[PDB]
Design a protein around this ligand. Structure first.
Ligand SMILES: *CC(=O)N1CCN(CC#C)CC1
Ligand SMILES: *CC(=O)N1CCN(CC#C)CC1
Lengths: 304, 304
């Protein structure tokens, strides 16, 4: 028993991290097969970031300008291309440590592990959620760009995120592995509005089920609600509206615990209206939304 | 910027995990050089755990009874010995993936990463603290025993913990890599009192410094305190008494932020007496004690 914000084992991704330098800018890259993927702003100076013309900046660069180092050995660059906001540097050597992988574009509310890196070296790993407004609340310093987000299903790594920037508000923005930003963000040092964020309702209910499974039950009440009634409360507290698709995904947790999804919604409703009254749930004093129903099932069943 | 409960990259430890089976019991082992380390209760049946005589149970076992599998390949056991609560199975092959390592016994209040494993396979990684009462609040199901806790300094892995059991209260107990339990715990299925736990005061202040560095400053006040005055409040709220050694370890954070340690203590004092008033600090609604001053410095400087 016990419930933790658990990240995927980072080994398979550590073996893919490389350092990419272009001019005086050093970022992280992801080496899979004979391609190194990195944020295209590796070609910018700090001055260029204010209003970069990536096409014009990249034309001044040749294969030999991209210095790619994997640990202590240098990779030879034989091609470069820009795809959206990522650069793909073709190297002459396939990464011997390339795991089975896929590039996937995750949905808002889905979770993933981030391997924070600097100079191609891993510093740490943490679990986070893609916010409904397509930002992530990470831990990233200058040099972390190119660090990636991923999920793992047995032996296959699904890369979903590449870090590109910190908004002036301190939250983080990035792309899928095809270089498409999540959200309305552009790789430019300008003020950028992130949407109004909301709480991931389905994740909070999944976490409430994890709490019941692991012994924390004080919040269970004698009430029930309807999807319509619950959603009026969800709107007032800036929670995402719950749909039948969300109820269906909670089905296994509802079946395991014997607590109907709408009864769990009534518990959530009372917690939103009354607060925790100084109590905690799974060591937290707020309603946690960074665990999907799939995460709760996996952690509660010990999936390796 | 941003601050997360970050674990060490688990790659170096993943390469050491093996499955150990003895009779009908399967646990995880740690393969370093030509030795596999695992909890000695791998020799017990569920019945034996009530009151095991490990010496007598181990005498009925030969090298061929310990089935050690690393991924898909079987290791040949050529020796077995019990050291405190761990078994050391000498194998005929040195682990090719053995990182630079040390066995260290950590102090209460210190933090470490746990690589939760089942059947020798890694499921996830999370950061936790050794409680002042020598328990850990982990996430461990049956089969997770033998999973290990560790810290990493550049290329050296310092193994500090091996998981052995869940107390009836749902908290976790284990040993150092020499098989010595942290705390008064015994590897027996009996009711065992964990001491009164306390909050790791030095870690809370370190986290308050991390909050100031990362922008959360609402809790800073116009007050100061003394070590004596602060400790009277710490005693009332079951916080560990702050010593000059703790103040000294906070020195770098106090120097970086310009906030004297006793002024941060006065902020902590007001937070203990008044609560958060519905506000949050670094996305938390309670005072976090799972970040040491060293963790805050490392995460805030991007140590790889
Ligand atoms: C994204 C990142 O890590 N940064 C470091 C380099 N800065 C200047 C350039 C290019 C941008 C932020
Ligand atoms: C420690 C662990 O993972 N357990 C699974 C096996 N149980 C019976 C035995 C031996 C003990 C708990």
């Amino acid at each position: 028993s016990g419930f933790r914000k658990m990240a995927f084992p980072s080994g398979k991704v550590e073996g893919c991290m490389v350092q990419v330098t272009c001019g005086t800018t050093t970022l992280n890259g992801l080496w899979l097969d004979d391609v190194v993927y990195c944020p295209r702003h590796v070609i910018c100076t700090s001055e260029d970031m204010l209003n970069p013309n990536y096409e014009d900046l990249l034309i001044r660069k040749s294969n030999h300008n991209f210095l790619v180092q994997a640990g202590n050995v240098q990779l030879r660059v034989i091609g470069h291309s820009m795809q959206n906001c990522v650069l793909k540097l073709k190297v002459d050597t396939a990464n011997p440590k390339t795991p089975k992988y896929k590039f996937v574009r995750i949905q808002p509310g889905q979770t993933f592990s981030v391997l924070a890196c600097y100079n191609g070296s891993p510093s740490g790993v943490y679990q986070c959620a893609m916010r409904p407004n397509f930002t992530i609340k990470g831990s990233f310093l200058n040099g972390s760009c190119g660090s990636v987000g991923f999920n793992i299903d047995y032996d296959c790594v699904s890369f979903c995120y590449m870090h590109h920037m910190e908004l002036p508000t301190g939250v983080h923005a990035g792309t899928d592995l095809e270089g498409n930003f999540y959200g309305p963000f552009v790789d430019r040092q300008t003020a950028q509005a992130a949407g109004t964020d909301t709480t991931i309702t389905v994740n909070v209910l999944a976490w409430l089920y994890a709490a019941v499974i692991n012994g924390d039950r004080w919040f269970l009440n004698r009430f029930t609600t309807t999807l319509n009634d619950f959603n009026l409360v969800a709107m007032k507290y800036n929670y995402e509206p719950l749909t039948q698709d969300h109820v269906d995904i909670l089905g296994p947790l509802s079946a395991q615990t014997g607590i109907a999804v709408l009864d769990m919604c009534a518990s959530l409703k009372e917690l939103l209206q009354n607060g925790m009254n100084g109590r905690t749930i799974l060591g937290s004093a707020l309603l946690e939304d960074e665990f999907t129903p799939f995460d709760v099932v996996r952690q509660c069943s010990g999936v390796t």
